């Protein structure tokens, strides 16, 4: 029974000022490097414990002992994502109902139906880059975000955001990005109810109204027309939960659509951006991935079955998720009193944060080459210890979008490596911007066409 380390305190504010930074996850990573596999973090009125070791996280991932907690970040996102899957408690009726209704829409099988839509957007990205002039470069996270938002819009509700036709984001997106910024900024405020934050609160309410009005009109317009497109919205209007026999209500459908647009904007785009970053920093790895793409993608348009055969590209994406998991944490609560790792007693209700980037750096799992980009680490999942690799979270509350994200990312990265050579022309220094998620900021490359027709 050990006493837990705790980082430096600021009197009555305890640890809270440590998060007064534009890079709080990267600050918590540096604290974990100093304090080790577990530390206590206190703010006025709340305590959590940050876990970094596979030794403790494998226990935290025991669903008989721990359930998903809404972190303060998720509670603030819930003001616009409601009781959508991502911001619902496991015990709320609408979690299991929506989970049962939506699981078939997110399976490996369902991906065959979404593939043609994903290819539509992927072809738009390839044509954009084919059409750049000799003097020009690519804004990587900008273009990956254009792609991943457009893909979920088209597969979500058959809506074209037409992001490759715009410098300025669609108005829904300007509102969603500003709401996500206010949710994440609200975290840092020692003094939240101050009047210096009164404009922020007024803007948040306008942004919520914007997201609701576009999404509610999309739903209303679809029911009115009665058309049956094979998108998530059609599945949610016609689907019944096998348990309750009930469908989702129109308000819950709107929370699910907002949730899916947040995920498509924030997470998959981060993964593609980090994957291209590691490939241009690791030319031998880029070469082996480009060789797979050339051998497998033998048709102008990739097929679903071809994407399934891009195994090495799959390993590249997992190794990018290992070093920079774009969704960097999740939160758990103890269902009952229990002891963590035979050292740290917890009471019913005590909270934990899993710091995924640190878990993925555990040298007892990955060895001394832990900072190196080596996709071959992922050749044999049976050779990886339990709960060592958690970029999609844990158990019944794991990412429902995992198959969707990995299909889209494998397809697009495979087409990028087929069609272009890449140059890191600025010798880019990694700068990680934090929103809901992690993304390279300012990452730019030059892409020289291999002139292979679409
Ligand atoms: C690389 C891409 C992505 C990553 C890394 C990612 C990561 C995660 C993680 C870590 C969680 C667990 C969060 C927690 O325990 O608090 C999660 C949940 C979720 N993700 Fe994703 N996600 C990705 C893409 C997507 C996509 C494309 C969708 C939907 C189109 C999506 C929808 C969701 C939903 C709905 C949940 C909540 C599931 C539930 O609790 O029932 N994600 N994601
Ligand atoms: C993909 C979603 C990732 C969300 C990860 C959370 C991302 N947080 C952003 C800051 C770091 C990280 C986190 O540890 N937050 C906790 C801690 C906390 C609670 C209350 C006030 C301030 C901070 C929380 O939100 O409860």
From Swiss-Prot:
Q: What induces it?
A: By pentobarbital. Expression is negatively regulated by repressor bm3R1 at the transcriptional level.
In the record, the effect of residue 46 to Q/S is given as: 2-3-fold decrease in binding affinity for N-myristoyl-L-methionine as substrate
* Residues engaged in binding heme: 399
Q: Tell me the part of the parent protein that is shown.
A: 3 to 456 of 1049
- The segment annotated Cytochrome P450 runs over 1-454
Outcome reported for the amino acid change (mutating residue 187 to Q): Higher activity in the hydroxylation of highly branched fatty acids
- Where along this sequence does the record place binding of (9Z)-hexadecenoate? 50
As for family, the record states: In the N-terminal section; belongs to the cytochrome P450 family.
What protein name applies here?
A: Bifunctional cytochrome P450/NADPH--P450 reductase
User: Outcome of residue 392 to W?
Assistant: Large decrease in the heme reduction potential in the presence and absence of substrate arachidonate. 10% reduction in efficiency to couple NADPH consumption to substrate monooxygenation
Write down the position(s) of the site called Important for catalytic activity. 267
Instruction: List locations, semicolon-separated.
Output: Cytoplasm
Q: Which gene encodes it?
A: cyp102A1
- Tell me its applications: This protein is a target of protein engineering. Its selectivity-directing and activity-enhancing mutations have been extensively studied and the designed mutations allow this enzyme to act on non-native substrates and/or in order to enhance production of synthetically desirable end-products.
Function field:
Functions as a fatty acid monooxygenase. Catalyzes hydroxylation of fatty acids at omega-1, omega-2 and omega-3 positions. Shows activity toward medium and long-chain fatty acids, with optimum chain lengths of 12, 14 and 16 carbons (lauric, myristic, and palmitic acids). Able to metabolize some of these primary metabolites to secondary and tertiary products. Marginal activity towards short chain lengths of 8-10 carbons. Hydroxylates highly branched fatty acids, which play an essential role in membrane fluidity regulation.
Q: Note the effect listed for residue 263 to H/K.
A: No significant stimulation of NADPH oxidation induced by addition of fatty acids and no hydroxylated products, but cytochrome c reductase activity levels are identical to wild-type enzyme. More negative reduction potential with dithionite
What is the organism of origin for this protein? Priestia megaterium (strain ATCC 14581 / DSM 32 / CCUG 1817 / JCM 2506 / NBRC 15308 / NCIMB 9376 / NCTC 10342 / NRRL B-14308 / VKM B-512 / Ford 19) (Bacillus megaterium)
Question: In which domain of life is the source organism classified?
Answer: Bacteria
């Amino acid at each position: 029974i050990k006493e837990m380390p705790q980082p430096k305190t600021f009197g009555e504010l305890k640890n809270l000022p440590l998060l007064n930074t534009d890079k709080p996850v990267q600050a918590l990573m540096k604290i974990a490097d100093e304090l080790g596999e577990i530390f206590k973090f206190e703010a006025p009125g709340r305590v959590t414990r940050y876990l970094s070791s596979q030794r403790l996280i494998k226990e935290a991932c025991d669903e008989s002992r721990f359930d998903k907690n809404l972190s303060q970040a998720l509670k603030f996102v819930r003001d616009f994502a409601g009781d959508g899957l991502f911001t619902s408690w496991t015990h709320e009726k609408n979690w299991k109902k929506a989970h049962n209704i939506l699981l078939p829409s997110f399976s490996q099988q369902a991906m065959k139906g979404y593939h043609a839509m994903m290819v539509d957007i992927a072809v738009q990205l390839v044509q954009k880059w084919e059409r750049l002039n000799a003097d020009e470069h690519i804004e990587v996270p900008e273009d990956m975000t254009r792609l991943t938002l457009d893909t979920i819009g088209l597969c979500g509700f058959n809506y074209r955001f037409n992001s490759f036709y715009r410098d300025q984001p669609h108005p829904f997106i300007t509102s969603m990005v500003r709401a996500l910024d206010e949710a994440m900024n609200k975290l840092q405020r020692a003094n939240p109810d101050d009047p210096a934050y009164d404009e922020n609160k007024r803007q948040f309410q306008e942004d919520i109204k914007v997201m609701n009005d576009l999404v509610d009109k999309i739903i209303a317009d679809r029911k009115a027309s009665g058309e049956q497109s094979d998108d998530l919205l059609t599945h949610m209007l016609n689907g019944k939960d096998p348990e309750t026999g009930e469908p989702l209500d129109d308000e819950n459908i709107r929370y699910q659509i907002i949730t899916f647009l947040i995920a498509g904007h924030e997470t998959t785009s981060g993964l593609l951006s980090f994957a291209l970053y590691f490939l241009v920093k690791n030319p031998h790895v880029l070469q082996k991935a480009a060789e797979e793409a050339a051998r497998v993608l033998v048709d102008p348009v990739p097929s679903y079955k071809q994407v399934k055969q891009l195994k090495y590209v799959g390993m590249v994406l997992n190794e990018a998720l290992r070093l920079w998991p774009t969704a960097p944490a999740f939160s758990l609560y103890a269902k009952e009193d229990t002891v963590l790792g035979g050292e740290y007693p917890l009471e019913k209700g005590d909270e934990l944060m899993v710091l995924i980037p640190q878990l993925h750096r555990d040298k007892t799992i990955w060895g001394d080459d832990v900072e190196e980009f080596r996709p071959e680490r992922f050749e044999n999942p049976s050779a990886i210890p339990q709960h060592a690799f958690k970029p999609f979270g844990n158990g019944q509350r794991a990412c429902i979008g995992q198959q969707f994200a990995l299909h889209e990312a494998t397809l697009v990265l495979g087409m990028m490596l087929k069609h272009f050579d890449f140059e890191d022309h600025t010798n880019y220094e990694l700068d990680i911007k934090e929103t809901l998620t992690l993304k390279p900021e300012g990452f730019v490359v030059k892409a020289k066409s291999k002139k292979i027709p679409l």
